[PDB]
Amino acid sequence: PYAESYIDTVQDRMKQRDRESKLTGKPINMQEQIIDGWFLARFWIFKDQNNNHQTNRFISWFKDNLASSKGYDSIAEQMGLKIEALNDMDVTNIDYTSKTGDTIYNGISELTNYTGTTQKMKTDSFQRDYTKSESTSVTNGLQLGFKVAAKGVVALAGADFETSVTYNLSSTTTETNTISDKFTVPSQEVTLSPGHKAVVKHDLRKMVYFGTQDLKGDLKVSFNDKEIVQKFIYPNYRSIDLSDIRKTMIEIDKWNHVNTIDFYQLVGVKNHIKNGDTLYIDTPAEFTFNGANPYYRATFTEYDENGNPVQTKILSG
């Protein structure tokens, strides 16, 4: 062709993509970087299989799909790009601030008394419903066309609240879940004199936690490209994983006598590849739990026959 190799263009593009992510701190486009590597690996195999016409047509098919609007989305489903989290991701550097939220119940239970004798009269228990919400956002999203969900246990140690929340590793968009839970207001202890009164004020409210964190863990990457690869060259089919992309880019740089880049260290800032199918990512995240464990305050003031407060005991909070 006596022109610039598109192969060299892709190799340099993956380098420039990873550098921008690491020099700006912004996340890399995981879809484009892995697909660009899959393309380079598949070509490095095709070039040695004695079909230069299909190899050149495989380059054309990849280029034209990139000129399309869908771009890397159309290729991602054709070669079956799959990224899934099979284990809980680690939550680190939890820093949260707490506040009280909306009222769940605010009222009183007025306990009179008329017996001529000292007593230990008691209120009764009741049960008020509420809904708690959990919202998370990933700062360094993988920028994928498909949603890649993960779980992580966020333990707000100093607040006795601990929940497993869901994240969206593909986009910075907020991921929200709402769940119905219930608080049982307890019966409260009160010692009363003849003719004295007891009031118990209930203040039950949602608790709100705003926090930052990191999210680290392994992701399984696989290519389901058996069908699309064989539409170009059918014989001598072999499956390909991230190991083959690392080998390809090493051998491409060796061909041009330049420093060998490590694909495993070319997947965006704070990220790296562990082996053929394990991508390790480390992204900042933010969370907001609205509801969680409700804050409950209960006070009791004893009034004598003249309506004067005798004693005031704290029962919750």
**Residue 265 forms part of a structural domain:** yes
| Phi-psi region at 93: left, alpha or beta (left = phi > 0; alpha = psi -120 to 50) | left
**DSSP-assigned letters across all residues of 27-71:** PP-HHHHHHHHHHHHHHHHHTTTT-HHHHHHHHHHHHHHHHSSST
**Residue 39 forms part of a structural domain:** yes
**Residue 111 forms part of a structural domain:** no
Experimental method: X-ray
Instruction: Give Cα 175 to chain centroid, integer Å.
Output: 8
DSSP single-letter state for residue 263: G
Cα–Cα distance, 161 to 95 (Å, whole number): 14
Backbone angles phi, psi at 245, to 5 degrees: -70, -40
The residue among 167, 170, 31, 176 whose CA lies nearest residue 89 is 167
**Residue 231 forms part of a structural domain:** yes
**Residue 36 forms part of a structural domain:** yes
Backbone angles phi, psi at 117, to 5 degrees: -130, 155
**Residue 310 forms part of a structural domain:** no
- Single-letter residue type at 273: I
137 membership: H or E segment, kind and range:
strand 126-138
Structure resolution in Å?
A: 2.3
β-strand pairing of 126-138 with 278-303:
antiparallel
Total tally of structural domains belonging to the chain:
1
Angstrom distances, CA of residue 310 to CA of 123, 191, 192, 299, 304: 19, 11, 10, 14, 6
**Residue 29 forms part of a structural domain:** yes
What domain range is 30 assigned to? 6-84+219-279
**Residue 272 forms part of a structural domain:** yes
Cα–Cα distance, 142 to 165 (Å, whole number): 18
**DSSP-assigned letters across all residues of 164-217:** EEEEESS-SS-EEEEEEEEEEEPP-B--B-TT-EEEEEEEEEEEEEEEEEEEEE
